[PDB]
Amino acid sequence: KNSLALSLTADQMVSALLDAEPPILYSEYDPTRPFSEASMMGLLTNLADRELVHMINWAKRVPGFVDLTLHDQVHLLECAWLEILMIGLVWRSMEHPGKLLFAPNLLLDRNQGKCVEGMVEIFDMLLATSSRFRMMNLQGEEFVCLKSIILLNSGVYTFKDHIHRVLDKITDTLIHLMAKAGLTLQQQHQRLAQLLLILSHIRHMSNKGMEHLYSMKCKNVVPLSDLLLEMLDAHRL
């Protein structure tokens, strides 16, 4: 019954999460520009589908996740999947002010966002989040913490004790990293708050994104994988 996750030290937690990180994937090598709405959405949904497969395998490696029942694992992923894709995108884009690095060969700006109906608004939100992270000098070790927090937190209220203990362990780990980096006590708690508050904006973006995906499903122009269709349906949206 007892989870190995709770017995980990902060360094073991950090190391486990870094090791669990999924790879950065590529989009198609076709240099045809500009995009159409259909072709841009085609590339993005294809990429989302491939990242999702790696995400499900990453989640299995987040300490404490596989201690849950299969059904609780499914609920958490269904609730958090787009938030997790988005935080990853924002992290990848951080060193590219003004652009979203969907893939190393698919770096888009907000103007290209306009290629898709209803999309530029989402681009703008993601770009703002990227800029915020850049201005806070977000570190990779903090990023992997925040991403695992999303996985565990987003669905937890729509069910928990194990999950909340694991979340606590990740808070300890985040604070560990900030003290390690030289921040005073007051700076550590201020920074902890700043980071967690961004998670509210990520939830908002995910919810807007889910409405966008639904409309795309309804427009029935862009083929969507069965996996993407099932993740969308979970939101009964």
Binding site: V53, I56, K60, L70, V74, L77, E230, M231
Partner: peptide, 10 residues
């Protein structure tokens, strides 16, 4: 029956 089930169990 969900792709998600298969992926979580594979």
């Amino acid at each position: 029956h969900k792709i998600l089930h298969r992926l979580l169990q594979e």
